[PDB]
Every structure is written in C-alpha cells, then in structure tokens.
Amino acid sequence: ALSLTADQMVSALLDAEPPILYSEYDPTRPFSEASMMGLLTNLADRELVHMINWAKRVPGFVDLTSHDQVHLLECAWLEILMIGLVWRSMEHPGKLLFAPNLLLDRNQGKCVEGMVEIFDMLLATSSRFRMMNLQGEEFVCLKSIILLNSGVYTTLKSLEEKDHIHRVLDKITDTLIHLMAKAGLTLQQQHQRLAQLLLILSHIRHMSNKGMEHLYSMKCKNVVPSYDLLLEMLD
Amino acid sequence: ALSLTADQMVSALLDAEPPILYSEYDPTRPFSEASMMGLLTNLADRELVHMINWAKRVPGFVDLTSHDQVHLLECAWLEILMIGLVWRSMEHPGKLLFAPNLLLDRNQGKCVEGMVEIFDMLLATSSRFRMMNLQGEEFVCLKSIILLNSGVYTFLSSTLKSLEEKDHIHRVLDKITDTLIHLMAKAGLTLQQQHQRLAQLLLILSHIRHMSNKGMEHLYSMKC
Numbered sequence: 001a002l003s004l005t006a007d008q009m010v011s012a013l014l015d016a017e018p019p020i021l022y023s024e025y026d027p028t029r030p031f032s033e034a035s036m037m038g039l040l041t042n043l044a045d046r047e048l049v050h051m052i053n054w055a056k057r058v059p060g061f062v063d064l065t066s067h068d069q070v071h072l073l074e075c076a077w078l079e080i081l082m083i084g085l086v087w088r089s090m091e092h093p094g095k096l097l098f099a100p101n102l103l104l105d106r107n108q109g110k111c112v113e114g115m116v117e118i119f120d121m122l123l124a125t126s127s128r129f130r131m132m133n134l135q136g137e138e139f140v141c142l143k144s145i146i147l148l149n150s151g152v153y154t155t156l157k158s159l160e161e162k163d164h165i166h167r168v169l170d171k172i173t174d175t176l177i178h179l180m181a182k183a184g185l186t187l188q189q190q191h192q193r194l195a196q197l198l199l200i201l202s203h204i205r206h207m208s209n210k211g212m213e214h215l216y217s218m219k220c221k222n223v224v225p226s227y228d229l230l231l232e233m234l235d
Numbered sequence: 236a237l238s239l240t241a242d243q244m245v246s247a248l249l250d251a252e253p254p255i256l257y258s259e260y261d262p263t264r265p266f267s268e269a270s271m272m273g274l275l276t277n278l279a280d281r282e283l284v285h286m287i288n289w290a291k292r293v294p295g296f297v298d299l300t301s302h303d304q305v306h307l308l309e310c311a312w313l314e315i316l317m318i319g320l321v322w323r324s325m326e327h328p329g330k331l332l333f334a335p336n337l338l339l340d341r342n343q344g345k346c347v348e349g350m351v352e353i354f355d356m357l358l359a360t361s362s363r364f365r366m367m368n369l370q371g372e373e374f375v376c377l378k379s380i381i382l383l384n385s386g387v388y389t390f391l392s393s394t395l396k397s398l399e400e401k402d403h404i405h406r407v408l409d410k411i412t413d414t415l416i417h418l419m420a421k422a423g424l425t426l427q428q429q430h431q432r433l434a435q436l437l438l439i440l441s442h443i444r445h446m447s448n449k450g451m452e453h454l455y456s457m458k459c
C-alpha cells in the first residue's frame with residue numbers, strides 16, 4: 001500500500017520533509033580548520049538524526065527489513081545531506097546555506113585543507129538546479145530515489161526486497177513525469193528533464209564518494225596531537 | 236550533426252563500437268598477484284587506445300575543444316572500461332569476460348588483495364543488465380552518456396567558450412535520451428514502461444560512477 005496516486009505520493013514526500021536546522025555559529029571569533037570542521041560535524045550529526053525520522057516516512061522504505069533500511073541509509077546518507085544542502089543553497093548564488101545563520105562562500109571553504117574541491121562541486125550542482133528551475137516536488141522525489149537506489153545494487157526474501165524497491169522507484173518515476181505533465185512540458189521535454197535529473201544523481205554520487213574520501217583523510221590526520229590541544233596542557 | 240534522426244544516432248554509435256581485444260595471457264606460466272595485475276593493466280592500456288578512437292566517432296564529441304575532449308576522457312575512462320566489461324560479461328553469469336581468452340570467476344578475484352570487492356560489484360551490475368535484458372542499442376547510448384555526462388559538471392563554467400561547449404554536450408545528451416526512448420517505443424513498450432526503463436538505465440549509471448570511484452581507490456592502493 002505504497003501504490004497510491006501520483007498526487008498522494010508527492011503529498012506524502014512533502015509532509016515527511018525534515019526541519020531546516022540552525023547552527024550555534026559564533027560570529028565574533030573568526031574561523032579555524034578545527035572550529036569550522038567542528039561546526040559542520042555537529043550540524044551534519046544533527047541532520048543525520050532528522051534524516052532517519054524522514055527515511056521512516058518515505059513510502060515503501062518502512063516495508064523493508066531493518067538490516068536493509070540500515071544498509072540503504074548507510075549508503076545514501078552523505079548523498080541526501082548534499083542534495084539537501086544544494087536545495088537550500090539555490091536562493092543564494094555563490095554560497096552554500098549550511099543553515100539559515102551559516103552561509104559560506106567558496107573562499108571560506110579554503111579554511112579546511114582540500115574542502116574547496118567539494119565546495120566548488122556543491123556550488124556547481126546548486127547553479128545547475130537553479131538554471132533547471134528544479135521544483136520542490138521534483139526535489140523530494142530525487143531525495144527518495146537517492147535513498148532507495150544507492151544501496152540496492154549491493155535468498156527468496158532478498159530478491160522480493162530488491163523487487164519491492166524497484167516497484168517503488170517505478171512509482172516515483174511515474175510521479176516525476178506526472179509533475180512534468182502537470183507543469184505543461186511536452187512529452188519530449190518530460191523524458192529529457194527526467195533524464196537531466198537522473199544524470200545529476202550520478203554527479204551527486206561522485207560528490208558523495210569524494211566527500212567521503214575527504215572525511216576519512218581528516219579522521220586519519222588526527223592520529224596526532226593538535227596545536228589547540230597541546231596549547232591548553234601547558235596553560 | 237545534431238540533425239541526426241534516432242535511427243541515424245544508433246547506427247552511428249553501433250558502427251563506432253571498438254573490437255573486443257585480446258589479453259597477452261600465456262596459459263603456460265601460473266597466476267600471480269604481480270602477473271594478473273600486469274595482464275589486466277596491459278589489457279586496460281590497450282583498451283584506452285581503442286576508447287579514444289571510439290570517443291572520436293561518438294556524435295558531438297569531435298565538435299568540442301581538445302582540452303574538453305581530454306577532460307571528459309580523464310573523468311569517464313574507468314567508467315567506460317567497466318560498463319564495457321559488464322556488457323561483455325552478461326552472457327557469462329558469475330564470471331567477468333575481461334577478453335575472449337581472459338574469463339575470471341569471483342574466486343580468481345581473491346588472487347589480488349581487496350580486488351574481490353570490485354569484482355562482486357561488476358558481477359552485480361552484470362546480473363542487473365541481464366535481468367533488465369539490456370539490448371546492445373541501449374548499451375551504446377549509455378556508453379556515450381557516460382563519456383559526455385561524467386566530466387561536464389567541472390569544465391570551469393566561467394567563459395563564453397566553455398558555456399557553448401556545456402550547452403552543446405547537453406543538446407547531445409537530449410538527442411541520446413530521444414534515441415533511447417525511440418528504441419523502447421520501437422520495441423513496443425507502453426509510454427509508462429518507456430519512462431520507467433529510461434529511469435532504470437540512468438539509475439545504473441549512478442552505480443557505475445560509484446564502482447569507478449571504488450575501483451580508482453583500489454588502483455591507487457596497488458601502486459605501492
């Protein structure tokens with residue numbers, strides 16, 4: 001019973017949208033590698049709690065095994081963080097709206113070694129959605145595709161589960177086209193926009209893998225005392 | 236040559252298909268981590284020469300600057316190796332057809348530290364295309380999308396020239412979308428089944444981008 005009308009599916013996915021969280025950003029003290037990463041980490045960890053709540057209201061998702069729901073989130077979480085980040089940043093050219101009181105330009109990216117690479121990509125993806133005129137109904141469908149699609153490629157039970165996920169992606173495809181039909185695009189423009197949107201999910205998968213490679217290099221590069229750390233122990 | 240009918244575009248892309256290359260595999264000298272990686276490297280480097288020849292016969296590609304053709308290949312090469320590898324492996328469940336004389340099962344993957352991880356993914360993607368019943372006309376369209384799509388979100392996006400080039404690439408991806416649907420229409424799928432199949436195909440390009448990045452992380456760890 002995730003086989004509901006296209007208008008029901010959009011309504012369901014709009015409802016499930018998590019809140020737009022606030023940072024505890026301190027505007028008086030300037031940034032540092034340690035402090036900016038600390039800020040963004042706290043934010044991201046808060047968003048992860050709200051994303052699990054969301055995941056449970058996405059039609060089809062709850063129907064799966066727990067092991068499978070865990071697996072799809074483990075595989076999708078940074079993708080969903082990033083499409084979310086990019087969606088909020090549409091109204092603010094050249095900048096990423098990490099939170100309504102936390103708006104970073106490309107140059108503030110450089111405050112973290114090799115973070116600019118991922119910023120430029122997120123900024124580019126933002127620019128793209130803007131020029132596309134991505135609608136919020138389209139946005140929520142993409143978020144759900146990313147959750148269901150990104151874990152699915154990794155017994156009778158496991159087969160019926162893959163098949164259930166594929167049935168739901170079909171429903172969401174149907175919904176996306178319904179939105180495009182309703183918005184008055186020709187059939188050609190419908191298939192072409194559906195294609196342009198799904199091709200972007202591939203750039204978002206790439207942005208994620210790069211981001212993930214970056215986050216790991218930051219954990220690795222603290223098998224070693226910091227300046228901030230060694231400072232206090234004398235002081 | 237954005238004037239190409241759907242039947243012309245498929246014919247063009249089928250023509251451009253490279254030959255299925257041979258490995259220097261010597262069945263009179265046992266397997267080795269060193270030797271199998273040496274084999275695969277030699278093969279892949281030979282395929283890269285054939286891929287450039289192909290790339291030049293993909294409609295639109297030649298119209299770009301050299302810098303841009305280079306950039307798209309720099310970003311797409313391992314993706315195209317892998318979709319190629321996956322396509323050839325469809326008819327051989329559990330095994331990867333690296334070449335007609337080089338057919339490795341999952342277990343021969345273990346002969347290289349952490350290579351099984353990438354084998355299982357390529358095998359899974361093979362399983363997927365099989366259950367989809369991917370046609371060779373669909374295959375060649377995906378190959379072309381991967382080349383044109385995977386570099387396009389970098390370029391630079393800050394001069395009149397690079398803008399006209401991004402716009403040209405986007406016009407061609409639109410043409411290839413049109414082609415894919417035409418093939419599905421011709422094969423007699425309903426409109427619903429057409430957009431659903433188009434979606435299922437493009438969602439796999441996402442797994443192929445993922446498989447590539449993992450593969451690339453693996454290739455780096457082997458230079459050691």
Ligand SMILES: CC1=C(c2cccc(O)c2)[C@H](c2ccc(OCCN3CC(CF)C3)cc2)Oc2ccc(O)cc21
Pocket residue numbers: 040041043044045047048081082084085098114115116118119211212214215
């Ligand atoms: C894209 C992006 C970030 C970003 C990401 C990569 C590179 C980069 O430069 C910035 C970092 C970030 C920082 C730390 C992260 O992970 C912390 C670890 N927790 C544990 C849990 C996994 F188990 C995640 C994730 C993202 O700040 C964000 C905050 C909110 C948001 O919507 C997106 C981001």
Ligand SMILES: CC1=C(c2cccc(O)c2)[C@H](c2ccc(OCCN3CC(CF)C3)cc2)Oc2ccc(O)cc21
Pocket residue numbers: 275276278279280282283316317319320333349350351353354357450451453454
């Ligand atoms: C899936 C796959 C590979 C594969 C890929 C990743 C992981 C894995 O386990 C296997 C390796 C491989 C090994 C080395 C490679 O390149 C190294 C050097 N080349 C030349 C150029 C430098 F100038 C790069 C490329 C592919 O063998 C292949 C051969 C042909 C083919 O269609 C695909 C592959």
